[PDB]
């Protein structure tokens, strides 16, 4: 049926330093439109299964 407990992050502000882990699950301002905690448009959740 498809397992979805395995997640990965696609959106981030910048890259990662070597040997570093980030678990911050916050909305990302993909476009010029601010999110203000609401996805709406030009905002997406960084993590997907």
């Amino acid at each position: 049926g498809g397992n979805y407990n395995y997640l990965y992050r696609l959106f981030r502000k910048s890259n990662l330093k070597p040997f570093e882990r980030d678990i911050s699950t916050e909305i990302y301002q993909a476009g010029s439109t601010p999110c203000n905690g609401v996805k709406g448009f030009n905002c997406y959740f960084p993590l997907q299964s």
Binding site: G31, S32, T33, F41, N42
Partner: protein, 49 residues
């Protein structure tokens, strides 16, 4: 616009293209980029569109 079995094909060459204005437009229901992230089109570029 033309039909789906007779789709219009257009060639773009020898001009500057600003994708930022299209990306910031909210009238587009779906805007999906597969090969590259939409942010970095203005940096790297190719020989034809």
């Amino acid at each position: 616009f033309a039909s789906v079995y007779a789709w219009n094909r257009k060639r773009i060459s020898n001009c500057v293209a600003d994708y930022s204005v299209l990306y910031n437009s909210a009238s587009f229901s779906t805007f999906k980029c597969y090969g590259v992230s939409p942010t970095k089109l203005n940096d790297l570029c190719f020989t034809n569109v």
